[PDB]
Design a protein around this ligand. Structure first.
Ligand SMILES: [Mg+2]
Ligand SMILES: [Mg+2]
Ligand SMILES: [Mg+2]
Ligand SMILES: [Mg+2]
Ligand SMILES: [Mg+2]
Ligand SMILES: [Mg+2]
Ligand SMILES: [Mg+2]
Ligand SMILES: [Mg+2]
Ligand SMILES: [Mg+2]
Ligand SMILES: [Mg+2]
Ligand SMILES: [Mg+2]
Ligand SMILES: [Mg+2]
Ligand SMILES: [Mg+2]
Ligand SMILES: [Mg+2]
Ligand SMILES: [Mg+2]
Ligand SMILES: [Mg+2]
Ligand SMILES: [Mg+2]
Ligand SMILES: [Mg+2]
Ligand SMILES: [Mg+2]
Ligand SMILES: [Mg+2]
Ligand SMILES: [Mg+2]
Ligand SMILES: [Mg+2]
Ligand SMILES: [Mg+2]
Ligand SMILES: [Mg+2]
Ligand SMILES: [Mg+2]
Ligand SMILES: [Mg+2]
Ligand SMILES: [Mg+2]
Ligand SMILES: [Mg+2]
Ligand SMILES: [Mg+2]
Ligand SMILES: [Mg+2]
Ligand SMILES: [Mg+2]
Ligand SMILES: [Mg+2]
Ligand SMILES: [Mg+2]
Ligand SMILES: [Mg+2]
Ligand SMILES: [Mg+2]
Ligand SMILES: [Mg+2]
Ligand SMILES: [Mg+2]
Ligand SMILES: [Zn+2]
Lengths: 54, 155, 232, 60
RNA sequence: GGCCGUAACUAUAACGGUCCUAAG
RNA sequence: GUAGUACAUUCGCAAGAAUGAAACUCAAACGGAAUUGACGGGGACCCGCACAAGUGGUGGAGCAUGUUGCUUAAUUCGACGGUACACGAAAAACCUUACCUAGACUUGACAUCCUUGGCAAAAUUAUGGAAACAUAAUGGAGGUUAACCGAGUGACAGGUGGUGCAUGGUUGUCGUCAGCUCGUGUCGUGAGAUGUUGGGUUAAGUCCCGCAACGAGCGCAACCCUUAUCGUUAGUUACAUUGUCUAGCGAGACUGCUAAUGCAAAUUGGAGGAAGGAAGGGAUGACGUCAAAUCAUCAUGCCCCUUAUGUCUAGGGCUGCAAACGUGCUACAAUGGCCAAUACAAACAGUCGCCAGCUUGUAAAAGUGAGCAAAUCUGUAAAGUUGGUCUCAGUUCGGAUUGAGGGCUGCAAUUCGUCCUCAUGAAGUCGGAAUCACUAGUAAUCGCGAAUCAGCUAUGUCGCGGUGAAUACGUUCUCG
RNA sequence: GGUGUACAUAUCUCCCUGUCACGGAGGGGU
RNA sequence: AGCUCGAGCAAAUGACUCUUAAUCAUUGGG
RNA sequence: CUGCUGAUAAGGUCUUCAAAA
């Protein structure tokens, strides 16, 4: 995102900001209840986002 | 007020006649960054030289550039009114560069058909010391000879 | 000339974000970005006597968690937990009754070397008609005695009610602003004086961060215990 | 006139094309970021304060 | 020797333009 | 200052010499010496696309946009050398909108404090209506009033109204230039000086020697991101011509080794190395100057309006037009115009969206309709290569302007949207005095994407890749 | 010719400069 | 017209600037 | 190595204070 610094004029002087959506993939073959119950107690931190697809 | 001398990039030998001047004149006739188009122009002109002069195109090209190639340069130096000129001996590299630049500039102005034939006929005319680049070299040489007196004072 | 914000230059490298959430859509991103601003502005403009150094906000799909670091949390607590319910209801009205609130007060250790509360004290002294030279001198000497590195205080505006604006700066100790490794805390406050507005900007240097990482660690809350509740 | 315009913007109009996006913190009408619902001059302040998660300065 | 314009009350023109003569 | 003036006197042929006031006027003086800056058409040294060597433009024509001026009911306001003019505005048909005309309102469209009840506000259907708003309807989520829906009620709300020369915040500029200061000490009656100047070396007040100075702070540099080689981790939605590619960690480059000369910093050359001596690019911008810009992002002192400078709505306007300037696009053409086939990207974006395929249409597009919440599906790459044709002409260049028929968005396209087709075919054949940008993947040139956005002659802005140059001898001149 | 006799001056536009004058390019008026 | 012959000055109103001067427009005034 | 090179309306801020911590 590119934003002009100044309040009124001088469009030439403008700064920039970035936001990165880092992405990882991990596929489990067979889990079973023995692993699902343990997975229930993980408590992933808020910044991380899960997109479980079953 | 720079006190640094610029570096020099490689000239690269031509991959057809193995003559660097061919690559130099390709880069000189470059426009819009079209290497393919410039190379086509040069090679078509050289083939027309084959068709006309019945001699080696590289030899004809060298005979043209050596004849067009100047000796003296007049540098403008103003003091009070107008400019009094100064004749100075040029390096060989700038000599060749000026020869090629004049050749291209006077080739892209002749009255003829496609630039292929334009530059080809300009080269064949300059091979015999009768052309427009020849006139340019003659003019600068005569001007330097006239202003030979102020050659001692340069700056 | 103009200098980039000291906090903004260091954010995302050696400083974590004050609000940590991931919204669903662009419509919700604006609502969540405004509600947190309202909550923080509430905690700062009112209940000011508690020296609230900083408030962080942490939200999920539906749950709001607030971490309020304060120097004197007794004023937030009130008499036998009275004002606590008032501020809880204020926050619930701000965000919504449909969500679950997890407000958590935290006593901040070694408060003196925190630019927010230093600037707030500066602004209060300015508004209370206290002489500026004495005010800045006492604030600087107490900040230095707290055991930190250099502190730079810039106080600009209609100084002492004069008709021509001036500015007065006091740097005492090394304050490397171009260095990114330095732990520099910057705060800015407005003293609303009878003659207008005075802008106080406090930079404080708190050593060098020699451990690579996006913080994930407390920043001058750890020297004493930092354990206060009101949570679940 | 700013409070009335802000209130009118919140209020739904009688035509769909009548609706425009104003900043939610301030009331600026032009140069509004629909990704964040915040004008440029308030987006800069929020980014410098750390309010918007993940918005760090870019070096490219 | 002429002609024309020109100064923050008016008035005038220190000043500027131009034609001619051997010189005005 | 009057003024070496005037009168009187003496001398002199004469110019004049000697002597020499006052009236009036000012608070100082073309006063003295010394200090810090600024300046010099004064010297010495050093830098920058500054000059020089090249490339491509601008000023000439048409068009887009902004500005000055004028006109109008309004053409809202601001920005005015460098540091304003494709700027605020990353989207003016309605809204935006702050302007004009007109129809309506008054503790008000919005809010708090108080005495007080909640058994509503919406939305939509009727009639009057340009719409505001009125009279009637379903009388409504809910939770007993929580929020909000009210009555009473005066403090008041409200102001894009003035003052950026009362301010906070933010920003332009000198300038990413290398400067700006402080503590202690010493010199001087004092302003002040020293350190910061001197010699080497750098981009650098960078560092090393010298030195009545010894140190320190901000600035410089490094730490941060990215590109260039490699190792390891992982192999789906990448690869699957098997090790590309993507993204975490790490190695690597440190004047580290060597030769020269210097006291030392250090400078130059060589080796190996993907990379060599700030490896390329970005973020990062000291004290202060211009009372520089913004009260129209926001906040705010003071002044001003309070049945109006406050509020709602409809229409018009910000798009005018004898003119002038700035910034851009398109051209004046065979290094080209048109037609056909065809190869090679990166980055980004996408569920009121990206839209594959198919059918219809000369085409903009319409209908059907899968796929994709995305390394999976979609967003046609163009210059380039080959072939055909034009054969140097105001033309098969150039597209302005103009008439007609259609497409899409939208309540609504006349003022004032853009696209397609058909038809017409202005100027313009390289642009005067004078000026601009640029030192390698740079200039030039060709496409692609995104932001604001229902739609938009954005040709603008921010990004990505393809092809890809010429020149730098030197500081005599020119600006800083 | 607006002023002195097509010319000069004068007038307008653009360069030049921080700005003006000077200077340079172009246009019009009996 | 206040003055010199509807014109130009004078006066006023605004624009302009920190405020004026100058400038720009408008303008009543026989 | 000596061309040419002229001018810039008036009045003005800006130091409040060390008594002291
Ligand atoms: Mg407002
Ligand atoms: Mg809209
Ligand atoms: Mg005497
Ligand atoms: Mg005198
Ligand atoms: Mg100077
Ligand atoms: Mg000079
Ligand atoms: Mg040049
Ligand atoms: Mg062009
Ligand atoms: Mg033009
Ligand atoms: Mg204004
Ligand atoms: Mg305007
Ligand atoms: Mg202004
Ligand atoms: Mg409108
Ligand atoms: Mg009910
Ligand atoms: Mg009740
Ligand atoms: Mg200012
Ligand atoms: Mg110095
Ligand atoms: Mg000395
Ligand atoms: Mg020294
Ligand atoms: Mg740096
Ligand atoms: Mg000003
Ligand atoms: Mg400016
Ligand atoms: Mg106001
Ligand atoms: Mg309207
Ligand atoms: Mg406009
Ligand atoms: Mg062809
Ligand atoms: Mg596939
Ligand atoms: Mg297709
Ligand atoms: Mg071809
Ligand atoms: Mg013609
Ligand atoms: Mg054509
Ligand atoms: Mg139309
Ligand atoms: Mg032609
Ligand atoms: Mg450079
Ligand atoms: Mg003013
Ligand atoms: Mg001259
Ligand atoms: Mg004069
Ligand atoms: Zn805003």
């Amino acid at each position: 995102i590119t934003i002009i610094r100044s309040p009124h004029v001088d469009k030439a002087s403008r700064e920039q900001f970035e936001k990165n959506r880092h992405k990882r993939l991990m596929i489990l073959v067979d889990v079973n209840q023995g692993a699902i119950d343990s997975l229930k107690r993980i408590k992933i931190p808020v910044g991380v986002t899960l997109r479980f697809s079953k | 007020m720079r006190k640094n001398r610029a570096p020099k990039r490689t000239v690269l030998p031509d991959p057809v006649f193995n003559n660097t001047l061919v690559t130099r004149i390709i880069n000189v006739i470059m426009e819009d960054g079209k290497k393919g188009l410039a190379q086509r122009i040069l090679y078509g002109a050289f083939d027309l030289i084959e068709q006309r002069t019945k001699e080696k195109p590289l030899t004809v090209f060298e005979r043209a550039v050596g004849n067009v190639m100047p000796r003296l340069e007049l540098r403008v130096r103003r003091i009070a009114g107008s400019n009094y000129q100064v004749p100075t001996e040029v390096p060989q590299d700038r000599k060749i560069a000026l020869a090629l630049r004049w050749i291209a500039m006077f080739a892209r102005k002749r009255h003829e058909k496609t630039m292929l034939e334009k530059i080809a006929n300009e080269i064949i005319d300059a091979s015999n010391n009768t052309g427009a680049a020849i006139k340019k070299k003659d003019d600068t040489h005569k001007m330097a000879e006239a202003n030979k007196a102020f050659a001692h004072m340069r700056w | 000339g103009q200098k980039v914000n000291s906090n903004g230059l260091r954010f995302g490298i050696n400083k974590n974000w004050i609000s940590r959430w991931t919204a669903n859509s662009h419509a919700q991103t604006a609502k969540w970005l405004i509600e947190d601003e309202k909550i923080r502005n509430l905690f700062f403009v009112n209940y000011r006597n508690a020296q609230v150094s900083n408030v962080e906000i942490e939200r999920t799909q539906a749950t709001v968690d607030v971490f309020v670091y304060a120097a004197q949390p007794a004023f937030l607590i009130g008499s036998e937990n009275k004002n606590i319910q008032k501020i809880t209801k204020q926050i619930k009205q701000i965000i919504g009754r449909t969500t679950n609130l997890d407000l958590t007060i935290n006593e901040i250790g070694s408060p003196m070397l925190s630019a927010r509360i230093i600037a707030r004290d500066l602004a209060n002294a300015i508004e209370a008609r206290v002489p500026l030279r004495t005010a800045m001198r006492q604030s600087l000497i107490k900040v230095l005695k707290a055991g930190a590195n250099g502190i730079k205080v810039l106080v600009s505006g209609r100084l002492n009610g004069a008709e021509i604006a001036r500015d007065k700066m006091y740097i005492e100790g090394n304050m490397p602003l171009s260095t990114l490794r330095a732990d520099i805390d910057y705060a800015l406050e407005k003293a609303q004086t009878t003659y207008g507005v005075i802008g106080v900007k406090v930079w404080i240097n708190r050593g060098m961060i020699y451990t690579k990482g996006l913080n994930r660690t407390p920043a001058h809350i750890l020297h004493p215990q930092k354990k206060q509740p009101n949570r679940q | 006139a700013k409070k009335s315009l802000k209130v009118k913007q919140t209020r739904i109009p009688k035509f769909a094309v009548r609706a425009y996006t104003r900043c939610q913190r301030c009331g600026r009408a032009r140069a509004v970021l629909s990704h964040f619902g915040v004008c440029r001059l308030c987006f800069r302040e929020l980014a410098y304060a750390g309010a918007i998660p993940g918005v760090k300065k870019a070096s490219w």
